[PDB]
Amino acid sequence: MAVKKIAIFGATGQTGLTTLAQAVQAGYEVTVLVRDSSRLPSEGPRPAHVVVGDVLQAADVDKTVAGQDAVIVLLGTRNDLSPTTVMSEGARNIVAAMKAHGVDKVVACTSAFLLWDPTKVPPRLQAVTDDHIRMHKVLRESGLKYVAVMPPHIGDQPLTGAYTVTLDGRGPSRVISKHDLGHFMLRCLTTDEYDGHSTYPSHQYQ
Amino acid sequence: MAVKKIAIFGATGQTGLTTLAQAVQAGYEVTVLVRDSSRLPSEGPRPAHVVVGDVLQAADVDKTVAGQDAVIVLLGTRNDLSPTTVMSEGARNIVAAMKAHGVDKVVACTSAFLLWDPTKVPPRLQAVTDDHIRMHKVLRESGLKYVAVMPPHIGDQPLTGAYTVTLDGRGPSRVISKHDLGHFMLRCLTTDEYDGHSTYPSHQYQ
Ligand SMILES: NC(=O)c1ccc[n+]([C@@H]2O[C@H](COP(=O)([O-])OP(=O)(O)OC[C@H]3O[C@@H](n4cnc5c(N)ncnc54)[C@H](OP(=O)(O)O)[C@@H]3O)[C@@H](O)[C@H]2O)c1
Numbered sequence: 001m002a003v004k005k006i007a008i009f010g011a012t013g014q015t016g017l018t019t020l021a022q023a024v025q026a027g028y029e030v031t032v033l034v035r036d037s038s039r040l041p042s043e044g045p046r047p048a049h050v051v052v053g054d055v056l057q058a059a060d061v062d063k064t065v066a067g068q069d070a071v072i073v074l075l076g077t078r079n080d081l082s083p084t085t086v087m088s089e090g091a092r093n094i095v096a097a098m099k100a101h102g103v104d105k106v107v108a109c110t111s112a113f114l115l116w117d118p119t120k121v122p123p124r125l126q127a128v129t130d131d132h133i134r135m136h137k138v139l140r141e142s143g144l145k146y147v148a149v150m151p152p153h154i155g156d157q158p159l160t161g162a163y164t165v166t167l168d169g170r171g172p173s174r175v176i177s178k179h180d181l182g183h184f185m186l187r188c189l190t191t192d193e194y195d196g197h198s199t200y201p202s203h204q205y206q
Numbered sequence: 207m208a209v210k211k212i213a214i215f216g217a218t219g220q221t222g223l224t225t226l227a228q229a230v231q232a233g234y235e236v237t238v239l240v241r242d243s244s245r246l247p248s249e250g251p252r253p254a255h256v257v258v259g260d261v262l263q264a265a266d267v268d269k270t271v272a273g274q275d276a277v278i279v280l281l282g283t284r285n286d287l288s289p290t291t292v293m294s295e296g297a298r299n300i301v302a303a304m305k306a307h308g309v310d311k312v313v314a315c316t317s318a319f320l321l322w323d324p325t326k327v328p329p330r331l332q333a334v335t336d337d338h339i340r341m342h343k344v345l346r347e348s349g350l351k352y353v354a355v356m357p358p359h360i361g362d363q364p365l366t367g368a369y370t371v372t373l374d375g376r377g378p379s380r381v382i383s384k385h386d387l388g389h390f391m392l393r394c395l396t397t398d399e400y401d402g403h404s405t406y407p408s409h410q411y412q
Pocket residue numbers: 009010011012013014015016033034035037038053054055056074075076077078079086087109110111112128151152153154155
């Protein structure tokens with residue numbers, strides 16, 4: 001495998017769990033960073049390596065990024081809508097570790113609202129969106145091979161692999177299943193065509 | 207009222223660098239205080255005078271402010287996530303020096319968090335915001351002609367000189383390009399109309 005060792009940040013989350021499951025099935029050697037209180041469920045797929053720590057600690061991020069071929073970022077705040085910098089500060093640490101360890105490919109999830117008219121972002125989501133904006137700027141300015149994944153509403157529909165990928169603009173549907181979103185994150189590992197672009201995956205489930 | 211000589215503090219930062227470049231291109235005679243002169247560009251527009259020193263050192267500040275017509279403040283301490291007084295202590299040194307040398311005009315950047323509810327501030331940004339508030343009070347209480355510039359998110363969009371400025375309140379957009387922010391800092395040197403006001407520059411970027 002050209003890309004074989006990957007770090008996943010946010011593997012315990014909604015999209016992270018199915019991205020991990022798909023990655024292990026596809027043959028990836030996956031390292032995860034998990035917070036001490038929230039390990040992966042006993043019964044799910046097992047990653048190759050587990051680092052227990054916090055994306056806010058450079059040391060823990062360093063341990064997770066060392067030796068990888070690529071990084072997938074699915075960080076979030078589990079529907080807590082309070083003001084936060086955990087995603088942008090975590091991205092700062094990931095960028096610094098990637099530069100220090102010679103890793104170039106990062107596929108990182110923010111949100112479709114970064115392709116919206118900002119005056120139409122729902123105010124309830126503005127605080128989280130503000131940190132997505134901060135995070136995207138950190139990654140865009142890094143100079144790394146950065147795929148900016150900007151999905152609409154993440155749903156519970158099936159894995160299809162049949163979704164539309166819209167480049168640098170809003171796509172034709174307003175939903176992507178968490179399984180398809182994880183499928184796309186992994187697809188981004190084996191092609192350079194989305195590097196330096198914003199990508200909006202969306203689908204109609206029928 | 208005619209401003210030819212200015213000091214810029216924070217000239218090596220994100221906004222400082224483009225403010226400096228625009229100031230030099232426009233004809234200002236620019237003095238900068240830098241801790242490390244290698245962080246200034248070797249090419250293109252260069253300041254007329256470089257003082258090497260620290261805004262925490264009153265003598266370094268005094269030498270920067272001497273002979274100026276106005277002062278631009280673009281200090282920041284982005285890494286400080288716990289109580290910090292660098293900006294407010296710097297502002298105290300700047301105010302004392304301006305008074306000692308008869309400089310009457312200061313245009314200083316804090317943040318639009320000073321116009322929003324305090325619960326909007328992410329926990330890790332509370333220390334910087336608290337010190338922005340401390341710096342703002344120092345400048346308001348000085349009796350100097352003070353334009354408070356309180357920008358939203360600072361982006362990297364090209365210079366567009368077409369932004370909106372909202373007075374003593376927040377405006378419709380929540381982004382300002384660093385280039386447009388620098389452009390507005392310099393515009394504040396050419397008029398009295400913003401003295402004693404808070405200003406919110408923002409724009410929609412096409
Ligand atoms: N909700 C939507 O419909 C929607 C639409 C577009 C975009 N998005 C954005 O898409 C991204 C992924 O969403 P999601 O629902 O899949 O994620 P999620 O369920 O919120 O999972 C967040 C992940 O980030 C981890 N995490 C949080 N803080 C961490 C920290 N300090 N250190 C280490 N790991 C940390 C979490 O670990 P723990 O298990 O320890 O909590 C979890 O694994 C989010 O940024 C979300 O805002 C969501």
